[PDB]
Design a protein around this ligand. Structure first.
Ligand SMILES: CCCCCCCCCCO[C@@H]1O[C@H](CO)[C@@H](O[C@H]2O[C@H](CO)[C@@H](O)[C@H](O)[C@H]2O)[C@H](O)[C@H]1O
Ligand SMILES: CCCCCCCCCCO[C@@H]1O[C@H](CO)[C@@H](O[C@H]2O[C@H](CO)[C@@H](O)[C@H](O)[C@H]2O)[C@H](O)[C@H]1O
Ligand SMILES: CCCCCCCCCCO[C@@H]1O[C@H](CO)[C@@H](O[C@H]2O[C@H](CO)[C@@H](O)[C@H](O)[C@H]2O)[C@H](O)[C@H]1O
Ligand SMILES: CCCCCCCCCCO[C@@H]1O[C@H](CO)[C@@H](O[C@H]2O[C@H](CO)[C@@H](O)[C@H](O)[C@H]2O)[C@H](O)[C@H]1O
Lengths: 25, 25, 25, 25, 25, 25, 25, 25
């Protein structure tokens, strides 16, 4: 359960980071 | 570069949590 | 779109924290 | 107090994101 | 249980950060 | 510098986790 | 101690934003 | 505009955290 929660959080941060990276592209 | 590094770290964290989730199963 | 995802992320976080808070109450 | 602070912080963030989502309409 | 897995994860992350600090220098 | 700051946050988390872990010990 | 750590995180955020603000100036 | 607003908000947050840190001691 906690692993799942951590994965969801990391996935959100990764998508956020990706949109920032694309904005700077 | 900052956003890219954060995206990479977050994707590694997500993979690591997924692996833990699959192991805990 | 960014704002909407951030709000969803935060709601999920609040729900997790609330659960923790309730366990400690 | 830790969990309660975390809950308050998450709820604050959710409120701010929601206000932002509404403004961006 | 939860705290021990969280301490272990946090230590791994700190080591990864430290490695990156040394590589970047 | 970012890696250094990441490291401090990670160390902070690990010590908070250890304090909880010791109370559960 | 938690408030002191939160202050440090907020200061880091402020410096990061200031960096961006200056480059955008 | 965005970076300036983020800087302002982070500074507000830091002052709040500092005030709390001083109240607690
Ligand atoms: C917050 C979570 C961050 C965890 C980062 O873990 C590291 O991620 C790096 C990728 O940036 C990897 O390359 C490295 O091997 C790994 O240890
Ligand atoms: C607020 C963040 C919380 C903790 C974040 C921890 C992030 C650390 C991930 C960085 O990982 C590094 O990235 C690169 C990939 O090769 C390398 O350079 C380095 O050698 C590796 O270690
Ligand atoms: C709970 C709010 C925290 C928000 C995000 C975490 C902020 C982490 C910033 C670093 O804070 C410092 O971390 C040091 C070790 O790295 C500690 O040294 C001891 C120190 O005492 C603490 O001040
Ligand atoms: C990878 C992300 C990590 C998540 C957060 C981890 C942060 C770890 C501690 C950072 O250290 C802080 O760095 C700030 C910025 O370098 C400094 O503020 C500096 O800049 C502020 C912003 O104006 C001023 O208010 C301060 O006086 C000035 O010291 C502050 O003193 C220092 O303690």
């Amino acid at each position: 359960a906690x692993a799942e929660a951590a994965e969801k959080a990391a996935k959100y941060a990764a998508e956020a980071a990706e949109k920032a990276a694309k904005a700077x592209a």
